[PDB]
């Protein structure tokens, strides 16, 4: 909408209070121009037409019940926007600072959230296994972080070029998490699965192992379910992707870790300029070794954790 930039104020799924970006033009809508070519959040009403109606509000508050799924998509699709751009030098998920667009409440009770390839759809829970999705901002970046892989490698979404495609979305969310500095941690969905469950997750990525996704290549899933499994073998590069950054001892190999800013510089490195569609595994630890050795030399400690942490999971 063509309007003036406002400030509107409201509170997300977890009762948090926050200030978004609004344009007003009669009602506010939820639409943020200080970030590219904007973000842009919608109401699909409960259904499944997408993306819906762009949200309008008319007093610029947004405490609604109602409104919290909307705020919070909004609020942290500017967040993890604010952490390509500052952290990578990268202008939204095209890097030419496309418009973000959201929609929640789609669907009724949808346990779940996506990319669709033009932009991000949250379920609203059925309030049992989840509560709106978009309350979870690792879940609101691993979902961009798809559109910024289809935009750069643009892993094919099946096997291993697919779990890499998960695993990516799922450090940088975790990532994007961190970088928000709210309860951070290397689980994935904490902040919205199972309200009446404490201390779980969606999956883990220090410890795949827990909710039984394979920390071993020895341990892959070669089945055909899960699109060959990319949910499921996700869990060996979010693995290695967790030794590189905090380091550890893992089926007896050592790892040294280098942090979560070099891991962040090594795999979008790897990601923009080495990862293919097609990429596996092993392709993907040559990447990351190259991406390592272009940024740190190749004696480096940052190549040889590189190297420690795919031996430490069984990939060469
Ligand atoms: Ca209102
Ligand atoms: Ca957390
Ligand atoms: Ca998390
Ligand atoms: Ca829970
Ligand atoms: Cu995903």
Same mark, same amino acid.
């Given at each position: ?5 406002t ?35 919608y109401?699909?009403k ?10 309008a ?32 030098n990268?202008?939204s ?20 959230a996506?990319?669709?390839? $033009?932009?991000?759809?949250? /379920?609203?829970? &059925? ?6 999705? #978009? @309350?979870? +901002?690792?879940?609101? *970046? ?5 559109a ?15 779990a890499?495609n ?9 990532l ?8 951070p ?7 919205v699965?199972?309200?009446?469950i ?15 996704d394979?920390?071993?290549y $020895?341990?892959?899933?070669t /089945?055909?379910? &899960?699109?060959?499994?990319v949910?499921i073998? #996700? @869990?060996? +590069?979010?693995?290695? *992707? ?44 040559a ?9 740190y ?20």
């Amino acid at each position: 909408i063509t309007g003036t930039s406002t400030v509107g104020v409201g509170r997300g799924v977890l009762g948090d209070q926050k200030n978004i970006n609004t344009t007003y033009s009669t009602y506010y809508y939820l639409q943020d121009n200080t970030r590219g070519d904007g973000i842009f959040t919608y109401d699909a009403k409960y259904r499944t037409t997408l993306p819906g109606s762009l949200w309008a509000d008319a007093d610029n508050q947004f405490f609604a019940s109602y409104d919290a799924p909307a705020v919070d998509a909004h609020y942290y699709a500017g967040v993890t926007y604010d952490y390509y751009k500052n952290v990578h030098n990268r202008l939204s998920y095209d890097g030419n600072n496309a418009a973000i667009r959201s929609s929640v409440h789609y669907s009724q009770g949808y346990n779940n959230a996506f990319w669709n390839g $033009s932009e991000m759809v949250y /379920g609203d829970g &059925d309030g049992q296994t989840f509560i709106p999705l #978009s @309350g979870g +901002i690792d879940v609101v *970046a691993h979902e961009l972080t798809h559109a910024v892989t289809d935009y750069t490698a643009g892993l094919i979404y099946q096997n291993e070029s697919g779990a890499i495609n998960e695993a990516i979305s799922d450090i940088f969310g975790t990532l994007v998490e961190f970088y928000a500095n709210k309860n951070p941690d290397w689980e994935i969905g904490e902040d919205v699965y199972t309200p009446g469950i404490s201390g779980d997750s969606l999956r883990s990525m220090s410890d795949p192992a827990k909710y039984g996704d394979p920390d071993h290549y $020895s341990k892959r899933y070669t /089945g055909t379910q &899960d699109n060959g499994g990319v949910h499921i073998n #996700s @869990g060996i +590069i979010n693995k290695a *992707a967790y030794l590189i950054s905090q380091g550890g001892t893992h089926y007896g190999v050592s790892v040294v870790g280098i942090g979560r800013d070099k891991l962040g510089k090594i795999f979008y490195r790897a990601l923009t300029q080495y990862l293919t569609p097609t990429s596996n595994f092993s392709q993907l630890r040559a990447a990351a070794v190259q991406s390592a050795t272009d940024l740190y030399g190749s004696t480096s400690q940052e190549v040889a954790s590189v190297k420690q942490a795919f031996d430490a999971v069984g990939v060469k």
